[PDB]
Structure formats: C-alpha cells, structure tokens
C-alpha cells in the first residue's frame, strides 16, 4: 500500500519504519529538514531499539523516504496516518494546533486529486476532535465530503517508548475507530498479520478507549507508589506486597471490579479503607488518590439520586437493598444510603429484595432490620409486580437475574435507572444508565 | 484436626462449614446465642449460597457445634481462628473491642491448657496488631509467652460475600502470617489440598497484603465509575468503553505498573491525565480520584527530593535522566524535575545518562537538550565511574542495567537512594529505597 505518514517523531517513525518493512511504500512528512534529513539518510532521530535498522531496510529497499513536501506525499499516497504531537496547553487542555495544520495541508491537497484519499488520525486525541475538529477542516480545505469524498478514521497506538518496535509487531490489540466502512477494512487489512484482536468501533469509542487505556496505566502507577509509600511507612517493603497482589489473578488482576456502576459499599471495602487512610495519615503518609476514594464513592450515590429525582415524579421503586445480589447483608449499602435520601426528601418509596425480606424473618440480623432500619425495611414489598405497577421509576439498584425480564419487556409508563448493567443499550427516554 | 472458630458472622460460619466439610472437628464460639441456637440447628444465619446445607452436613457427622464456652472450645481443640468483626471507629479507624476480648477469653482459657495451643487471627486487623495488641493480651492473660508456648499467626480471608463458598474451595490464594513455623506449618497442612500457592510471609506483610487487596479493589470500582461517568458525558457507553480495557492483558490486566517506585512522566501520560480531567470538569463531571493522580505523581518527586537532602551533602549524582531507561526521550521527566529542584536548591550534580548523552550527539533532539535545557544537560557527565566517584549520594532514576553492578558492589562512603527497585532487600544507614 502507498501510505504517508505525518510526523516523524517518537511514534510516527517507528510506523514509518514498521509499515517500510512489511512491505508498503511509505512516504514519511514532517515540517523539519533535520527529521527529514536523518529519516533519507537511513538514521534514527529517537533512541528506539532497532529503529535504525528498519530505517536502514526501508532505505535499502527504496520503500521509505521523507520529504517536506505535503502536496506531493498525498499525491503519491492512498492512505494519510496523521501522527503529530498534541502536547498540553497550559491549562491542561490538549493544544490541537498541529493538528489543525496538518488537517489544512491534506485537505487542500486532496481538492485537486481525483483519486479517493483516506485519513487515519493515529495521534491521541479527545473524544469528538474527529468529528468536531478534523472532519470540519478537511471538509472545508478541500471542499468535498467526509465519508464519501475521502476516507477518515482514527487509529490509535499502544506502543511505549523504549519497546516501541516489539510493541508493534505484538500489540494487546487493534483499535480502529470507523465512520466509513472503506477506511475500516483498510486499516483490517493493514493489521490483518498480527496476532491479537482487532476492534472496530466508532470515532468516539475509539478515542475514549485509548485515553482510558493510558490514565488507567497512570492511575495504577499512583496506586503502587501509594501503597507503596505506606508500607515503608509501616517498616515492610512495597515490593513484595505487591508482587503477591499480583499473584491473584481472580480478583486483582482480572476484570472483576472494572464494570462502570455504582458505589462500593458492604462492611470491607468502605472500613479497609478508611482503616488505611487513616493509619497512613497518622504515619504522616501522603496519600491523595487513596483518599480520594470514599468522595468518589458518595459522589457515586448522589448521581444515583439526581438520575431518580429528575422525573418530575415522587414514586420510586427501589430493586434491591442488599449490598449485593445473593446476599442479605445491609452493611454500608449504598442502595440503603440511597433510600435513606429518598425518604428524606419525601419520596413515595416501594422496595423489593428477596434476600433481606427472608432475612427480616428467618436468621441473624432481624432485630436490625426490625429495629434499626424500620423506616426502610417497612417499604419492602415481596411482590416485584406490584413494585414495579406502583411505582413511576423502577431503580434496578443490585444484579438479581429476577429483573431481566423487566429490563427486557417493561411496562409502559415507566422510567428505568439503571445502577447496575442490564440494559442492552445506551439511554433513551424510557432509561437511563448511571454510566451509559 | 480439632479447631475452634471465634464469631459466627459472614466469615466465621463459612469457615466453620467449609472446616467441617473437609473431616475437621469444629467447634464455633460466638457471644450471639441467637447465631449458636441456628448453627446447632444446623441452620444459616445469614443468606449465603450452599451454606445451610453444608452447616446441616456438619451437624449431621457430628463433626461441627456451637457454643458460647470458650474455654471448653479451646480446651478441644488444636487451633483457634479468630474470626470477629473489625467495623470502624467514627474516626475511621480500626475498632479492636471484639478482638481484645476475645484474646483475653483464649488466654484464661490457654493458662490452664497443657497442650500447646495455636492461635490464628484471621479478622482483617491493621499492621502492628498482633505484635502490639493480640501477643501482648494473650500472653499476659495466659502467663505464657508467644512462640515458645502457643502458636501465633495470621491467616487473611479473601472471600467474598454471595459467592464465599466457592471462593473458599478455589482461592485465588493462600496467605500466612507466620511468627513460629509451628503455627505456619499448621496451617499450611489446612490449605494444603487448595489448588493455589500458599503464601507464608511475616505477619506485617500479610496484613498490608490484605488492606492492600481490598484498597485495590475500591480503586478499580472508583476507576470504571469515573471513566463511565466521563464516557456517558461524552455520549458513548461506558461499559463498551470498559469492555476493551478489559481486552488488554498485557498492559491493562497485567502486573505491568503496578511496581512501586517513581513519579509517572513521559510525553503521554501526564498530557493525558491532564486533558482527560480537563474535558471531565468542562463537562462538569466531578472526578476526584482522576483528579488527585497529578497530585499524588508531584508528592512523589517531592519525596525522592526529600530522601536525598537528608544525608548532609550537596554531592549529588543522578544516575538516569530520560523518563524511561531505553530511551532519549526526556519530555515531563520526572529525573529532570528532581534534577531542577536539587540544582535550585544548590545541590552539585552529576548526571549520567547514556542515551541521552548519545542524543546530543545523533538525532534530532539536539536542540531542547543544548539550547532549551542546558543548566541540566551541562550536568552530563559520560563516565558512569567518575559519577560515582565524585558524587556522595547515587540516585538510582531509572532501570538502565549498567546500574546493578554499582548496587551488588557498592563502594565505600556512598549512600544510594533507589528509586525503582534495584536493591535486594529493604533499607539500611547505606541504601534507602523510595518504598522499602
Ligand atoms: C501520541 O501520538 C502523537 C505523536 O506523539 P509523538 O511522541 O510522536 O510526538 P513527537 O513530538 O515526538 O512528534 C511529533 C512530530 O510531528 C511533527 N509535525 C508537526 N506538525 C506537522 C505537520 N504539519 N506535518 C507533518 N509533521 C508535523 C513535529 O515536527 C514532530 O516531528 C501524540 O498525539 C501522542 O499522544
Ligand atoms: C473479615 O473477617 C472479620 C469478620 O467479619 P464478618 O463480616 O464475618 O463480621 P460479622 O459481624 O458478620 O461477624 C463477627 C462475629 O464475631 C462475634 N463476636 C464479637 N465479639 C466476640 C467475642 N468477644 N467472642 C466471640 N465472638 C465475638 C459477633 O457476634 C459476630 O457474630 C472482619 O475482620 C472482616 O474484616
Ligand atoms: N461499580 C462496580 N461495583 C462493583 C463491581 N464489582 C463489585 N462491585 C462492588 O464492590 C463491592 C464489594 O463486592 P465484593 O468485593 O464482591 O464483596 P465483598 O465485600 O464481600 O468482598 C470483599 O471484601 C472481602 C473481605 O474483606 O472480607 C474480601 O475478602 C473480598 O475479597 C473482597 O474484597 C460491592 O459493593 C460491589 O457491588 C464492578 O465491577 N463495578
Ligand atoms: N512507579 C512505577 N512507574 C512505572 C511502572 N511502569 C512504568 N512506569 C512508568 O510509567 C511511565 C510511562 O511508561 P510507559 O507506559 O512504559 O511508556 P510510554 O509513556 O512511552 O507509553 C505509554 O503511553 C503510550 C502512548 O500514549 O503513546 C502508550 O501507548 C503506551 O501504551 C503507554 O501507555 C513511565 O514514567 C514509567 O516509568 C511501575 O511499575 N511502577
């Protein structure tokens, strides 16, 4: 395949050199004559293991070369990767300003060339640039239409510095973000070789997938040094805690635990920790992620509560109440702090929940239930059709499979909140997910 | 084997089912007559698959019973867990009155025992408890010394509540707190038939093993939250979004930045935090924990700071400057910002970094290193032996290899401040690590 690349930096020559060798003419472009100059000359501008090498074959082989010349490149190209920098503003905001040239520069380029174009946007960028940013630019420079004009998609990289090469040739994944079908089987195509899935999903999932990718990389950093700051703390050494974390792939290393939802809540997690924010705290521990937490986790329950609340409507039917299905526990239930909000703010409250409606006669905890929250365990209905007939919104608040078939055929007059995962899709009128 | 179980609550009773099950004589005390009445009945007191059926087994053979006599409990049998509850105090902090009490029943009780008897906590308690809470009551309430006379360990739970059965007889592992091997290889000959490694280690470690799981699992809940929250903000499902993540398991699911140590940096996970919490609060999506990484990623830096200047000389040498050995690459460094700070603050520096020295050479980065940087590039110096032997303090920056023969062979008059992970153990009045 004829392809040109824009930007010849830390990820835009190593694509160069990548695709060089799996046989493709590249064209490489960038705005300096010194990358220009190192890239012709077969050297590596980067410290990257065995960059030079497939430098040196793309060279060899006649397939690579660079040049300023942007009209050219298209011209002489099919395919455009834009790879250029979007470093930070000084507010924190991404500065797309190279990227709005770059987007100039093609879309000329293309107003006077017949031949279909295709665009692939592998620089990291925010969620609606494509749409909002790029797509407008091109279309305007060069006149003609995204989609049917010329092809465009995004195509996000998961190489690090250091093992950029590796990482290519053996990535997790393939990310292709679509809008057009074309430009989505070329990209296929490109990737077909390598062994691991490749994933098409639109422009917007694409570019959410990969800034999650990388703050999830930072947010486990910052987990590790916490933790691992309090150990020293404590007189142990970090490292081997964590090496035997890292020995449970069940639950820590697993996706258990990474389904967007609600707040945590039982008698562990919230008491862990406050247990180790707190000792951290008196051993003069830093620890600002950790203790972030719990705000997060009531922030959580509030969401919750301005979904329900904005319905213009005081009957709710509350399913579930346990901290989760399957159990009767109540200890710090968010679905209790939620009904307990609620109740406060005068809301006609219906609750069901099996387990803790067996436990409220049968077991352990009656004098609780009786006793200690009787404003809330006195609104539990055993009937789930008469929660749901009563009530105007149904909160699906815990996974009980006994509310799929709500989900799925719901009455008419109803609004779902759904807390948990069971809906099918996106929000609509008739429901909503608190993260989707 | 003879045991006796401390409280019958959501742990408690599952051990003493699951003990039972297995051809252990078990024997559960717990103050609640309420919950032995039910037990003796062989009846659950809580809703919690399969446990009724394995309780009324017990009772069945013979081989499970419940009492509130203490010292007859112990007295029968060979080992007592202590499975009470650990709720917080208002403060946050760990409430120790159940298990104080129930380690001065088990040391009346023990200071008549002929036998040597063992003791296990496994109730989640804080690192320092068993040294400076439970050893110390029970000694003193029994006459006896721990070790010598009775076996002391711990033995953390990792069960979870709905599914506790289950995650009992398929652990993801076993962890031992071990004070005399005695008590370790008792309860090693316990788990022995799990298919899952059993992990002995001091009794500190596995309780900060144990906080350290269940802080995680908080921290991956808050994490799918607040990414769902931002993604359904954006318009897209979070759970898709989540969903790929979840694909990864080389650099998502993996132990890959989950070693403590430094600051995060680099070109792209700074920039992305920051542009990722920029668009939240544009959104107005509140994100505390995705808003206190930068935060926490400074305090890092800070304390590396804060390790070196503490030796009482400004001979400092950096051994690493780019942000991830392998590389050149030296945008947001977190080497160089230590480095500025230790030049502001009148430290004399040397620097050592191979590809960064290459760099200035070959390459295109010419220019930010000779002319954007020169206050710390001036501070290269090409001789890893000469850093050493002009500088007092050696800071370990980033993974190069050419730095472990400097850890196993360290010259004399040097201290070294470890920053990734170099040393073979923990710190001494020679090394010190930024978490161990
Ligand atoms: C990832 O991928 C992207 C690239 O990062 P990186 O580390 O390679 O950055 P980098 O800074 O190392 O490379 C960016 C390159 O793009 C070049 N460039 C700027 N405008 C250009 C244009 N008009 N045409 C062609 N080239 C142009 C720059 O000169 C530079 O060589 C970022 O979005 C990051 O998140
Ligand atoms: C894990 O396991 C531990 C227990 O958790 P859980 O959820 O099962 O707690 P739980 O509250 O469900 O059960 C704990 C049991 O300990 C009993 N208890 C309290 N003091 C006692 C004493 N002096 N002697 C005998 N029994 C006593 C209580 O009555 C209760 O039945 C916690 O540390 C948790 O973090
Ligand atoms: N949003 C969201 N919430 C989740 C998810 N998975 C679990 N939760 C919630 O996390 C909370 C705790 O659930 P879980 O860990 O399954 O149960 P439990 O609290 O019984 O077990 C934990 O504590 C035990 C203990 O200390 O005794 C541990 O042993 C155990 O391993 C768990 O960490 C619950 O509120 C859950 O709803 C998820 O993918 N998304
Ligand atoms: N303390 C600690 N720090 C770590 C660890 N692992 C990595 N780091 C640091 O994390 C930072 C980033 O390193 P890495 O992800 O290896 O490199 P890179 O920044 O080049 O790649 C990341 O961004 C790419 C990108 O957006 O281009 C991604 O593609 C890539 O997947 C990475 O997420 C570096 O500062 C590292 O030193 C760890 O286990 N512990």
């Given at each position: 395949m004829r392809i040109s690349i824009f930007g010849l930096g830390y990820v835009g020559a190593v694509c160069a050199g990548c695709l060089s060798a799996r046989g493709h003419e590249v064209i490489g472009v960038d705005v300096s004559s010194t990358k220009i100059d190192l890239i012709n000359q077969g050297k590596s501008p980067i410290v990257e293991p065995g960059l030079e090498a497939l430098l040196q074959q793309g060279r060899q082989t006649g397939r690579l070369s660079g040049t300023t010349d942007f009209k050219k490149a298209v011209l002489d190209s099919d395919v455009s990767f834009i790879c250029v920098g979007t470093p930070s503003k000084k507010n924190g905001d991404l500065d797309l300003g190279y990227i709005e040239t770059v987007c100039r520069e093609i879309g000329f380029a293309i107003r006077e060339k017949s031949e279909r174009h295709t665009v692939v946007v592998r620089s990291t960028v925010l969620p609606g640039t494509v749409n909002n940013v790029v797509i407008p630019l091109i279309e305007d420079c060069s006149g003609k239409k995204a989609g049917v004009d010329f092809g465009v998609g995004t195509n996000p990289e998961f190489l690090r510095e250091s093992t950029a090469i590796k990482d290519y040739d053996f990535p997790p994944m393939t990310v292709i973000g679509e809008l057009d079908k074309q430009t989505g089987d070329l990209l296929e195509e490109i990737y077909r070789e390598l062994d691991a899935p490749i994933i098409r999903k639109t422009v917007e999932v694409a570019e959410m997938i990969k800034y999650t990718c990388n703050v999830w990389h930072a947010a486990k950093v910052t987990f590790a040094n916490e933790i691992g700051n309090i150990a020293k703390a404590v007189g142990v050494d970090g490292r081997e805690v964590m090496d035997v974390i890292c020995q449970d792939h069940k639950l820590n290393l697993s996706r258990y635990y990474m389904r967007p939802g609600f707040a945590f809540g039982g008698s562990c997690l919230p008491k862990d920790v406050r247990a180790l924010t707190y000792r951290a705290s008196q051993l003069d521990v830093e620890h600002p992620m950790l203790g972030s937490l719990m705000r997060s986790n009531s922030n959580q329950v509030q969401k919750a509560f301005d979904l329900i609340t904005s319905h213009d409507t005081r009957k709710v039917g509350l399913?579930?109440?346990?901290?989760?299905?399957?159990?009767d526990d109540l200890r710090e239930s968010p679905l209790v702090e939620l009904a307990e909000m609620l109740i406060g703010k005068g809301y006609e409250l219906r609750i069901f929940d099996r387990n803790v409606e067996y436990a409220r006669v049968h077991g352990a905890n009656k004098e609780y239930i009786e006793s200690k929250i009787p404003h809330v365990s006195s609104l539990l209905v055993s009937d789930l059709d008469e929660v749901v007939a009563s009530s105007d919104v149904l909160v699906?608040?815990?996974?009980?499979?006994?509310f799929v078939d709500l989900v799925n055929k719901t009455p008419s007059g109803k609004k779902l909140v759904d807390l948990?995962?069971?809906?099918?899709?996106t929000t609509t009128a008739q429901a909503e997910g608190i993260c989707w």
């Open positions: 399913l579930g109440l346990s901290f989760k299905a399957g159990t699906l608040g815990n996974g009980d499979e006994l948990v995962g069971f809906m099918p899709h």
